[PDB]
C-alpha cells in the first residue's frame, strides 16, 4: 500500500502490550531459534535504533498503478477465474440473515463472542457482548443502526492496529518485525459475513485444485487428495511473496471485487461495496491515524479467501502476460492466502515471470531459496505448503503432512498460561506424521507432567480419517 496521510489526534488508541506466551519444559531441551514477538518499544531483545512503530508500517512502500492494457488483462483473468469458481460453487450467494451471520452455517464458523470489538467501541470500554447477543444471535441499537448506514453506503470506520502475540524467529524479534492484525469494527465483520458468508462457506466445502483454494481444508485427510493430484505433473513450484497482503494494489483489488462478487452471480449489490471499503483504509495506532491506499487489511475474517482468490488471478495474469494461449487448464494450483503450489506439464519459466508479477506490485521468489532462481523438474515431494511437506506413508500408501522438526520444537517450546494440556493434544496431531521415533523425542520433556497421546492411537485415528475403507478393509 501507499501511505497518503499521517495525522495526530487526541484520542489515544492503546495497543496494550505484554506477551501471554511463556516458555514450557521443552524450551530448555530444544533451545529453539525462536521467541515471543516484540510487543513493546522498550523490549530489550530489540536492536539499537529499531523503533517498533515504524517497522510495522515500513511494508507499505507503494500502490502499483497498473497499465490500461494490464488492467484489461487482469479483468479477463479475474472473470475467467470467477467463471471457474462460480461454476463449481454455484450461484447461491444470497445474503445471510443477522442470526446466520453471527451463529454461522455449515462451512462457516460462528463469530467469536469475546475478541476485540474494534473502534470506536474499544475507546468507550465496551466488549462485543454489550453490542451483540451471541447466544440469541441478535444485535443491539448501536450495531443495528450501523448496518442501516452500510445499506445506504454511508458507513465510515478506522481499523484498530493490533500487535500479533505469537512465536517468531529471533532475527524478526531483534529486527522488530512484529506482524499485525487490522481489527475492523465488529459490525463491519458482521455485514461482510452477511454479504459474502454464503460464498465463503461454499468455498470451504469445495476446497481443492479445481477452484485453487485450500481454505477450509483438513491437512490430515486432504493431503492424499492434493498429493496424488500434483504428483501427476512434470513440473511443480512453490512460490514465496514479500508482504503479499500489503502489496495488493488498489487496481487489482477493485477489479477482483468487481468481477468475482457480481449481482449476476447471486450476490447483493453491497457485496462489492463492503469489500471495496478495504482498499482505502484509516489505521489507528497509539496517537497516529495512518491513511493507506491499497493493500488488504491483515486479519479481517475473509482475508484468507480474498488473498487466495487474488493469488489464483495473479498466476493466470502472469502466464498470459508472458506466454500466449494460456488458459486455466494450461496449469494447476492450490493456494492458502500467500501460500501457493503451482504445477504444469509445460516447462514454464517462473524466473521470467518476476517482471510480470512486479506489474502487480508483487515480488516472487522460490520457497526452496537454496537455488539462485526457479528451476524445472521439481516434484510435489520437494515443496512446502501450510508449513507441511508431502511424504508417503509406507504403511497405508497415502500422502501425509509432515512439518519440520524445528517448527514442532518451536511450537512446543512456548504456550499461553494454562493451555499446555490442550496444546499438546493439538500438536500431537501435527507431530504424528514425523514417525514413531521423532514423535517420542518431541514429547519426551512433557512425559510425566501431561497426558501425551500414543503414536499408535493417533495413527489409527488418521488412517480412518483419510479413508474409512482403508481402515475397515484392514480388519480381515
Short mmCIF file of C-alpha atoms in Angstrom, two decimals:
data_model
loop_
_atom_site.label_atom_id
_atom_site.label_comp_id
_atom_site.label_asym_id
_atom_site.label_seq_id
_atom_site.Cartn_x
_atom_site.Cartn_y
_atom_site.Cartn_z
CA UNK A 1 0.00 0.00 0.00
CA UNK A 2 0.79 3.72 -0.19
CA UNK A 3 0.65 5.86 2.97
CA UNK A 4 -1.02 9.07 1.68
CA UNK A 5 -1.64 10.82 5.04
CA UNK A 6 -0.44 10.74 8.67
CA UNK A 7 -2.42 12.66 11.34
CA UNK A 8 -2.03 13.07 15.11
CA UNK A 9 -5.14 13.02 17.34
CA UNK A 10 -6.27 13.48 20.98
CA UNK A 11 -7.87 10.02 21.35
CA UNK A 12 -5.04 7.57 22.13
CA UNK A 13 -5.83 4.03 20.92
CA UNK A 14 -3.85 1.85 23.36
CA UNK A 15 -2.11 -1.16 21.77
CA UNK A 16 -1.99 -2.96 25.09
CA UNK A 17 1.24 -4.92 25.24
CA UNK A 18 2.92 -7.83 27.22
CA UNK A 19 3.18 -11.40 25.88
CA UNK A 20 0.80 -14.07 27.24
CA UNK A 21 3.13 -16.78 25.83
CA UNK A 22 5.53 -18.32 28.37
CA UNK A 23 8.26 -20.98 27.93
CA UNK A 24 7.49 -24.68 28.54
CA UNK A 25 9.56 -27.61 29.88
CA UNK A 26 10.58 -28.34 26.25
CA UNK A 27 12.26 -24.90 25.85
CA UNK A 28 15.30 -25.92 27.94
CA UNK A 29 15.69 -29.19 25.99
CA UNK A 30 15.33 -27.90 22.40
CA UNK A 31 16.63 -24.30 22.75
CA UNK A 32 14.88 -23.08 19.55
CA UNK A 33 15.95 -20.04 17.49
CA UNK A 34 12.50 -18.61 18.29
CA UNK A 35 10.64 -16.47 20.83
CA UNK A 36 7.59 -14.30 21.63
CA UNK A 37 7.13 -11.31 19.30
CA UNK A 38 8.42 -7.88 20.36
CA UNK A 39 5.23 -6.17 21.58
CA UNK A 40 7.00 -3.19 23.26
CA UNK A 41 9.34 -0.39 22.12
CA UNK A 42 11.13 -0.87 25.48
CA UNK A 43 11.71 -4.62 24.81
CA UNK A 44 15.45 -5.31 25.45
CA UNK A 45 15.67 -8.02 22.72
CA UNK A 46 15.24 -5.31 20.02
CA UNK A 47 18.32 -3.88 18.28
CA UNK A 48 19.63 -0.35 18.98
CA UNK A 49 17.83 2.27 16.84
CA UNK A 50 14.92 -0.02 15.87
CA UNK A 51 11.62 1.75 16.61
CA UNK A 52 8.80 -0.84 16.69
CA UNK A 53 6.20 1.69 15.44
CA UNK A 54 7.90 2.43 12.08
CA UNK A 55 8.93 -1.18 11.24
CA UNK A 56 5.25 -2.26 11.18
CA UNK A 57 4.21 0.29 8.51
CA UNK A 58 7.50 0.09 6.52
CA UNK A 59 5.90 -2.74 4.48
CA UNK A 60 3.71 -0.09 2.78
CA UNK A 61 6.16 1.02 0.06
CA UNK A 62 3.68 1.94 -2.74
CA UNK A 63 0.40 1.31 -4.57
CA UNK A 64 1.37 0.00 -8.03
CA UNK A 65 -0.77 1.77 -10.66
CA UNK A 66 -1.27 -0.83 -13.41
CA UNK A 67 -1.25 -0.05 -17.14
CA UNK A 68 -4.52 0.23 -19.11
CA UNK A 69 -3.57 -2.91 -21.08
CA UNK A 70 -2.55 -4.69 -17.83
CA UNK A 71 -5.85 -3.75 -16.12
CA UNK A 72 -7.73 -5.13 -19.15
CA UNK A 73 -5.66 -8.34 -18.96
CA UNK A 74 -6.28 -8.53 -15.19
CA UNK A 75 -10.08 -8.18 -15.59
CA UNK A 76 -10.14 -11.04 -18.14
CA UNK A 77 -8.15 -13.28 -15.74
CA UNK A 78 -10.42 -12.21 -12.85
CA UNK A 79 -13.58 -13.05 -14.85
CA UNK A 80 -12.07 -16.31 -16.18
CA UNK A 81 -11.16 -17.43 -12.64
CA UNK A 82 -14.58 -16.26 -11.35
CA UNK A 83 -16.22 -18.31 -14.14
CA UNK A 84 -14.44 -21.49 -12.94
CA UNK A 85 -15.16 -20.63 -9.29
CA UNK A 86 -18.90 -19.88 -9.62
CA UNK A 87 -19.40 -22.89 -11.95
CA UNK A 88 -18.08 -25.29 -9.28
CA UNK A 89 -19.59 -23.50 -6.25
CA UNK A 90 -22.89 -22.43 -7.88
CA UNK A 91 -24.66 -19.06 -7.57
CA UNK A 92 -26.47 -19.47 -4.22
CA UNK A 93 -24.71 -16.41 -2.78
CA UNK A 94 -27.68 -14.51 -1.28
CA UNK A 95 -27.15 -12.57 1.99
CA UNK A 96 -27.07 -14.39 5.34
CA UNK A 97 -29.53 -13.22 7.99
CA UNK A 98 -28.30 -11.47 11.17
CA UNK A 99 -28.71 -14.80 13.05
CA UNK A 100 -26.82 -16.87 10.45
CA UNK A 101 -24.06 -14.23 10.16
CA UNK A 102 -23.42 -14.33 13.94
CA UNK A 103 -24.12 -18.02 14.63
CA UNK A 104 -22.63 -19.32 11.34
CA UNK A 105 -23.76 -22.05 8.93
CA UNK A 106 -22.36 -25.37 7.63
CA UNK A 107 -18.89 -24.47 6.31
CA UNK A 108 -18.57 -21.17 8.24
CA UNK A 109 -17.66 -20.84 11.95
CA UNK A 110 -19.64 -18.69 14.39
CA UNK A 111 -18.48 -15.15 15.25
CA UNK A 112 -16.14 -15.04 18.26
CA UNK A 113 -18.04 -13.65 21.30
CA UNK A 114 -15.13 -12.09 23.31
CA UNK A 115 -12.49 -10.93 20.80
CA UNK A 116 -11.71 -7.21 20.26
CA UNK A 117 -14.73 -5.17 19.01
CA UNK A 118 -12.74 -2.51 17.07
CA UNK A 119 -13.38 1.25 17.07
CA UNK A 120 -14.96 3.31 18.46
CA UNK A 121 -16.10 0.62 20.97
CA UNK A 122 -12.63 -0.13 22.43
CA UNK A 123 -12.25 3.55 23.43
CA UNK A 124 -15.74 3.56 25.03
CA UNK A 125 -14.84 0.50 27.18
CA UNK A 126 -17.35 -1.90 25.57
CA UNK A 127 -16.87 -5.61 24.87
CA UNK A 128 -18.55 -7.48 21.98
CA UNK A 129 -21.20 -8.89 24.38
CA UNK A 130 -22.58 -5.39 25.05
CA UNK A 131 -23.24 -4.83 21.32
CA UNK A 132 -24.15 -8.32 20.04
CA UNK A 133 -26.05 -11.13 21.82
CA UNK A 134 -24.11 -14.21 20.64
CA UNK A 135 -26.43 -16.80 22.26
CA UNK A 136 -29.66 -15.46 20.69
CA UNK A 137 -27.88 -14.15 17.55
CA UNK A 138 -29.31 -10.61 17.69
CA UNK A 139 -27.90 -7.05 17.65
CA UNK A 140 -28.22 -4.00 19.93
CA UNK A 141 -29.24 -0.43 18.91
CA UNK A 142 -25.62 0.59 18.10
CA UNK A 143 -24.82 -2.23 15.63
CA UNK A 144 -28.38 -2.22 14.21
CA UNK A 145 -28.03 1.48 13.30
CA UNK A 146 -24.56 0.94 11.75
CA UNK A 147 -25.95 -1.80 9.45
CA UNK A 148 -28.50 0.74 8.10
CA UNK A 149 -25.63 3.08 7.10
CA UNK A 150 -23.94 0.19 5.24
CA UNK A 151 -27.21 -0.44 3.35
CA UNK A 152 -27.27 3.27 2.34
CA UNK A 153 -23.47 3.19 1.60
CA UNK A 154 -22.54 5.88 4.16
CA UNK A 155 -20.58 3.82 6.74
CA UNK A 156 -17.19 5.15 7.92
CA UNK A 157 -14.62 3.34 10.09
CA UNK A 158 -11.00 3.09 11.23
CA UNK A 159 -9.05 -0.17 11.61
CA UNK A 160 -7.60 -0.80 15.09
CA UNK A 161 -3.96 -1.89 14.69
CA UNK A 162 -3.21 -4.89 16.95
CA UNK A 163 0.22 -6.46 17.60
CA UNK A 164 0.02 -10.22 16.98
CA UNK A 165 1.19 -12.00 20.15
CA UNK A 166 2.88 -15.07 18.60
CA UNK A 167 6.09 -17.10 18.32
CA UNK A 168 8.58 -15.60 15.82
CA UNK A 169 12.23 -16.30 14.82
CA UNK A 170 14.97 -14.42 16.73
CA UNK A 171 16.05 -12.37 13.66
CA UNK A 172 12.49 -10.99 13.35
CA UNK A 173 12.20 -10.31 17.12
CA UNK A 174 15.52 -8.38 17.02
CA UNK A 175 14.57 -6.52 13.80
CA UNK A 176 11.17 -5.51 15.26
CA UNK A 177 9.23 -7.35 12.53
CA UNK A 178 6.09 -7.98 14.59
CA UNK A 179 3.08 -8.85 12.42
CA UNK A 180 -0.25 -7.08 12.99
CA UNK A 181 -3.98 -7.78 12.91
CA UNK A 182 -6.02 -4.89 11.49
CA UNK A 183 -9.02 -5.28 13.82
CA UNK A 184 -12.05 -3.87 11.99
CA UNK A 185 -15.28 -2.98 13.87
CA UNK A 186 -17.50 -5.97 14.77
CA UNK A 187 -20.47 -4.62 12.74
CA UNK A 188 -18.23 -4.45 9.62
CA UNK A 189 -17.24 -8.11 10.19
CA UNK A 190 -20.95 -8.88 10.76
CA UNK A 191 -22.02 -7.19 7.49
CA UNK A 192 -19.10 -8.67 5.49
CA UNK A 193 -20.25 -12.12 6.67
CA UNK A 194 -23.83 -11.13 5.70
CA UNK A 195 -22.71 -10.11 2.18
CA UNK A 196 -20.24 -12.97 1.37
CA UNK A 197 -20.54 -15.61 4.16
CA UNK A 198 -22.64 -17.91 1.95
CA UNK A 199 -19.91 -17.76 -0.73
CA UNK A 200 -17.16 -18.33 1.88
CA UNK A 201 -18.96 -21.37 3.35
CA UNK A 202 -19.35 -22.81 -0.18
CA UNK A 203 -15.62 -22.24 -0.90
CA UNK A 204 -14.71 -24.04 2.35
CA UNK A 205 -16.83 -27.07 1.35
CA UNK A 206 -15.42 -27.28 -2.21
CA UNK A 207 -11.69 -26.78 -1.44
CA UNK A 208 -9.30 -28.30 -4.00
CA UNK A 209 -7.11 -27.73 -7.09
CA UNK A 210 -10.08 -27.06 -9.45
CA UNK A 211 -11.00 -23.82 -7.61
CA UNK A 212 -7.37 -23.47 -6.45
CA UNK A 213 -8.09 -22.94 -2.76
CA UNK A 214 -7.06 -24.89 0.35
CA UNK A 215 -9.12 -22.63 2.67
CA UNK A 216 -11.30 -24.73 4.98
CA UNK A 217 -9.23 -27.89 4.29
CA UNK A 218 -8.11 -30.54 6.78
CA UNK A 219 -4.43 -31.38 6.02
CA UNK A 220 -4.70 -34.83 7.70
CA UNK A 221 -7.34 -36.12 5.24
CA UNK A 222 -6.78 -33.75 2.27
CA UNK A 223 -3.02 -34.36 1.73
CA UNK A 224 -3.89 -37.62 -0.10
CA UNK A 225 -6.32 -35.75 -2.39
CA UNK A 226 -3.84 -32.92 -3.11
CA UNK A 227 -0.84 -35.30 -3.10
CA UNK A 228 -1.97 -37.68 -5.85
CA UNK A 229 -3.14 -34.72 -8.00
CA UNK A 230 0.15 -32.74 -8.12
CA UNK A 231 2.18 -36.00 -8.42
CA UNK A 232 0.81 -36.45 -11.99
CA UNK A 233 2.54 -33.30 -13.37
CA UNK A 234 6.10 -32.99 -14.73
CA UNK A 235 6.97 -29.67 -13.03
CA UNK A 236 5.95 -28.33 -9.59
CA UNK A 237 6.78 -24.97 -7.97
CA UNK A 238 6.18 -23.45 -4.52
CA UNK A 239 6.42 -19.65 -4.63
CA UNK A 240 7.02 -17.11 -1.83
CA UNK A 241 5.93 -13.47 -1.52
CA UNK A 242 7.30 -10.49 0.43
CA UNK A 243 4.35 -8.76 2.16
CA UNK A 244 1.68 -10.37 -0.06
CA UNK A 245 -1.46 -8.85 1.51
CA UNK A 246 0.19 -5.40 1.85
CA UNK A 247 1.34 -5.30 -1.82
CA UNK A 248 -2.16 -5.89 -3.29
CA UNK A 249 -2.54 -2.79 -5.48
CA UNK A 250 -5.87 -0.92 -5.39
CA UNK A 251 -6.49 -1.60 -9.11
CA UNK A 252 -6.09 -5.39 -8.67
CA UNK A 253 -8.39 -5.36 -5.60
CA UNK A 254 -11.11 -3.24 -7.28
CA UNK A 255 -11.08 -5.34 -10.49
CA UNK A 256 -11.29 -8.60 -8.48
CA UNK A 257 -14.17 -7.37 -6.29
CA UNK A 258 -15.94 -6.18 -9.47
CA UNK A 259 -15.62 -9.48 -11.39
CA UNK A 260 -15.92 -12.08 -8.58
CA UNK A 261 -18.75 -10.55 -6.49
CA UNK A 262 -21.26 -9.55 -9.20
CA UNK A 263 -25.04 -9.43 -8.71
CA UNK A 264 -25.39 -11.83 -11.70
CA UNK A 265 -23.59 -14.48 -9.56
CA UNK A 266 -26.28 -14.18 -6.81
CA UNK A 267 -24.63 -11.51 -4.60
CA UNK A 268 -26.19 -8.38 -3.08
CA UNK A 269 -25.06 -5.05 -4.65
CA UNK A 270 -23.31 -4.11 -1.35
CA UNK A 271 -21.05 -7.22 -1.51
CA UNK A 272 -18.75 -5.35 -3.93
CA UNK A 273 -19.12 -2.17 -1.84
CA UNK A 274 -18.25 -3.61 1.60
CA UNK A 275 -15.17 -5.36 0.15
CA UNK A 276 -14.14 -2.15 -1.70
CA UNK A 277 -14.02 -0.29 1.67
CA UNK A 278 -10.92 -2.42 2.47
CA UNK A 279 -8.93 -0.75 -0.38
CA UNK A 280 -8.55 2.74 1.16
CA UNK A 281 -8.36 2.46 4.98
CA UNK A 282 -7.51 4.52 8.09
CA UNK A 283 -5.35 2.69 10.66
CA UNK A 284 -5.30 3.71 14.35
CA UNK A 285 -2.07 3.08 16.33
CA UNK A 286 -1.26 4.97 19.58
CA UNK A 287 -1.94 8.67 18.66
CA UNK A 288 -1.40 8.19 14.89
CA UNK A 289 -4.04 7.86 12.15
CA UNK A 290 -2.27 6.47 9.07
CA UNK A 291 -4.35 6.53 5.85
CA UNK A 292 -3.26 3.74 3.45
CA UNK A 293 -4.44 3.41 -0.17
CA UNK A 294 -4.20 -0.17 -1.49
CA UNK A 295 -3.39 -3.45 0.25
CA UNK A 296 -5.58 -5.90 2.19
CA UNK A 297 -6.01 -5.35 5.95
CA UNK A 298 -4.44 -8.28 7.82
CA UNK A 299 -6.90 -10.46 9.78
CA UNK A 300 -10.43 -9.39 8.81
CA UNK A 301 -12.11 -12.86 8.67
CA UNK A 302 -12.36 -13.00 4.83
CA UNK A 303 -8.59 -12.20 4.49
CA UNK A 304 -7.69 -15.85 3.73
CA UNK A 305 -10.31 -16.20 0.96
CA UNK A 306 -9.65 -12.77 -0.62
CA UNK A 307 -5.86 -13.39 -0.68
CA UNK A 308 -6.42 -16.90 -2.11
CA UNK A 309 -8.69 -15.52 -4.89
CA UNK A 310 -6.08 -12.85 -5.75
CA UNK A 311 -3.28 -15.47 -5.74
CA UNK A 312 -5.21 -17.52 -8.35
CA UNK A 313 -5.74 -14.46 -10.58
CA UNK A 314 -2.04 -13.43 -10.36
CA UNK A 315 -0.83 -16.79 -11.76
CA UNK A 316 -3.23 -16.60 -14.74
CA UNK A 317 -2.30 -12.92 -15.25
CA UNK A 318 1.48 -13.53 -15.10
CA UNK A 319 1.48 -16.51 -17.50
CA UNK A 320 -0.77 -14.75 -20.07
CA UNK A 321 1.39 -11.59 -19.98
CA UNK A 322 4.45 -13.73 -20.89
CA UNK A 323 3.18 -16.79 -22.82
CA UNK A 324 0.46 -16.94 -25.49
CA UNK A 325 -2.65 -19.15 -25.43
CA UNK A 326 -2.59 -19.72 -21.65
CA UNK A 327 -5.89 -20.93 -20.16
CA UNK A 328 -6.93 -22.38 -16.77
CA UNK A 329 -6.16 -25.97 -17.91
CA UNK A 330 -2.61 -24.95 -19.04
CA UNK A 331 -1.53 -25.40 -15.39
CA UNK A 332 -2.91 -26.38 -11.97
CA UNK A 333 -2.55 -24.84 -8.50
CA UNK A 334 -3.66 -24.76 -4.85
CA UNK A 335 -3.47 -21.69 -2.58
CA UNK A 336 -3.99 -20.62 1.04
CA UNK A 337 -3.59 -16.84 1.07
CA UNK A 338 0.03 -16.05 0.17
CA UNK A 339 0.92 -19.78 0.30
CA UNK A 340 0.93 -21.36 -3.17
CA UNK A 341 1.83 -24.59 -5.02
CA UNK A 342 1.69 -24.42 -8.86
CA UNK A 343 2.22 -27.31 -11.31
CA UNK A 344 2.20 -27.94 -15.07
CA UNK A 345 3.42 -30.35 -17.77
CA UNK A 346 4.76 -27.41 -19.83
CA UNK A 347 8.27 -26.18 -18.95
CA UNK A 348 7.06 -22.84 -17.57
CA UNK A 349 9.84 -20.31 -16.91
CA UNK A 350 8.90 -18.97 -13.44
CA UNK A 351 12.12 -16.88 -13.38
CA UNK A 352 10.79 -14.94 -16.42
CA UNK A 353 7.53 -14.22 -14.52
CA UNK A 354 9.33 -11.97 -11.95
CA UNK A 355 8.81 -8.76 -14.03
CA UNK A 356 5.20 -9.84 -14.78
CA UNK A 357 4.42 -10.32 -11.06
CA UNK A 358 6.20 -6.97 -10.46
CA UNK A 359 3.50 -5.16 -12.51
CA UNK A 360 1.05 -6.17 -9.71
CA UNK A 361 3.47 -4.83 -7.04
CA UNK A 362 4.39 -8.42 -6.06
CA UNK A 363 7.90 -9.89 -5.61
CA UNK A 364 8.04 -13.66 -6.31
CA UNK A 365 10.90 -15.94 -5.22
CA UNK A 366 11.19 -19.75 -4.86
CA UNK A 367 10.46 -21.19 -1.39
CA UNK A 368 13.42 -23.51 -1.98
CA UNK A 369 15.75 -20.49 -1.66
CA UNK A 370 18.99 -22.56 -1.81
CA UNK A 371 18.79 -22.27 -5.62
CA UNK A 372 19.60 -18.89 -7.21
CA UNK A 373 16.28 -18.88 -9.14
CA UNK A 374 13.35 -21.03 -10.27
CA UNK A 375 14.09 -24.43 -11.87
CA UNK A 376 12.24 -27.18 -13.76
CA UNK A 377 11.81 -30.81 -12.67
CA UNK A 378 10.73 -30.35 -9.02
CA UNK A 379 8.06 -32.80 -7.80
CA UNK A 380 5.40 -32.50 -5.07
CA UNK A 381 7.71 -34.28 -2.56
CA UNK A 382 10.13 -31.28 -2.65
CA UNK A 383 7.64 -28.44 -1.97
CA UNK A 384 6.26 -26.93 1.27
CA UNK A 385 2.59 -25.93 1.76
CA UNK A 386 0.95 -24.82 5.05
CA UNK A 387 4.35 -25.48 6.73
CA UNK A 388 3.99 -29.17 5.69
CA UNK A 389 5.79 -31.49 3.24
CA UNK A 390 4.22 -34.26 1.14
CA UNK A 391 5.71 -37.54 2.44
CA UNK A 392 4.47 -41.03 1.53
CA UNK A 393 3.16 -43.13 4.43
CA UNK A 394 4.51 -46.60 3.56
CA UNK A 395 2.01 -48.46 5.79
CA UNK A 396 -1.13 -47.21 4.01
CA UNK A 397 0.34 -45.76 0.79
CA UNK A 398 -1.20 -42.31 1.41
CA UNK A 399 0.40 -38.85 1.48
CA UNK A 400 0.74 -37.30 4.96
CA UNK A 401 1.51 -33.71 6.07
CA UNK A 402 4.97 -33.74 7.71
CA UNK A 403 6.10 -30.50 9.38
CA UNK A 404 9.78 -29.76 10.03
CA UNK A 405 11.05 -30.90 13.45
CA UNK A 406 12.49 -27.42 14.18
CA UNK A 407 8.97 -25.98 13.71
CA UNK A 408 7.43 -28.62 16.03
CA UNK A 409 10.20 -27.94 18.59
CA UNK A 410 9.45 -24.19 18.35
CA UNK A 411 5.66 -24.66 18.71
CA UNK A 412 6.09 -26.95 21.76
CA UNK A 413 8.64 -24.64 23.46
CA UNK A 414 6.07 -21.86 24.18
CA UNK A 415 2.42 -21.72 25.30
CA UNK A 416 -0.25 -19.44 26.82
CA UNK A 417 -0.69 -19.91 30.59
CA UNK A 418 -2.96 -22.85 31.50
CA UNK A 419 -3.36 -24.15 27.91
CA UNK A 420 -0.46 -26.66 27.67
CA UNK A 421 -2.57 -29.84 28.01
CA UNK A 422 -4.92 -28.62 25.25
CA UNK A 423 -1.96 -27.56 23.06
CA UNK A 424 -0.05 -30.87 23.40
CA UNK A 425 -3.09 -32.87 22.19
CA UNK A 426 -3.40 -30.42 19.25
CA UNK A 427 0.36 -30.52 18.42
CA UNK A 428 0.38 -34.34 18.76
CA UNK A 429 -1.98 -34.48 15.74
CA UNK A 430 0.58 -32.47 13.73
CA UNK A 431 3.63 -34.38 15.04
CA UNK A 432 2.36 -37.97 14.41
CA UNK A 433 3.35 -37.77 10.70
CA UNK A 434 7.08 -37.38 11.54
CA UNK A 435 7.12 -41.07 12.65
CA UNK A 436 7.28 -43.01 15.96
CA UNK A 437 10.91 -42.18 16.91
CA UNK A 438 10.60 -38.45 16.14
CA UNK A 439 7.20 -38.39 17.91
CA UNK A 440 8.75 -39.95 21.05
CA UNK A 441 11.61 -37.39 21.04
CA UNK A 442 9.37 -34.31 20.57
CA UNK A 443 7.13 -35.17 23.57
CA UNK A 444 9.86 -36.60 25.86
CA UNK A 445 10.12 -33.40 28.00
CA UNK A 446 6.35 -33.48 28.72
CA UNK A 447 6.29 -37.17 29.84
CA UNK A 448 5.10 -37.38 33.46
CA UNK A 449 3.69 -33.83 33.64
CA UNK A 450 0.94 -34.04 30.97
CA UNK A 451 -1.10 -36.61 29.05
CA UNK A 452 0.74 -37.45 25.81
CA UNK A 453 -1.34 -39.34 23.21
CA UNK A 454 0.21 -42.61 21.99
CA UNK A 455 1.62 -42.77 18.44
CA UNK A 456 -0.49 -45.90 17.82
CA UNK A 457 -3.78 -44.16 18.72
CA UNK A 458 -3.27 -41.04 16.57
CA UNK A 459 -2.02 -43.17 13.65
CA UNK A 460 -5.20 -45.30 13.68
CA UNK A 461 -7.32 -42.13 14.05
CA UNK A 462 -5.65 -40.71 10.92
CA UNK A 463 -5.97 -43.88 8.76
CA UNK A 464 -9.77 -43.84 9.27
CA UNK A 465 -9.99 -40.06 8.74
CA UNK A 466 -8.20 -40.14 5.35
CA UNK A 467 -10.09 -43.27 4.14
CA UNK A 468 -12.74 -45.32 6.00
CA UNK A 469 -12.45 -48.19 3.50
CA UNK A 470 -8.69 -48.45 4.21
CA UNK A 471 -9.18 -48.87 7.98
CA UNK A 472 -12.24 -51.13 7.52
CA UNK A 473 -10.53 -53.43 4.97
CA UNK A 474 -7.50 -53.76 7.32
CA UNK A 475 -9.80 -55.75 9.68
CA UNK A 476 -9.82 -59.06 7.74
#
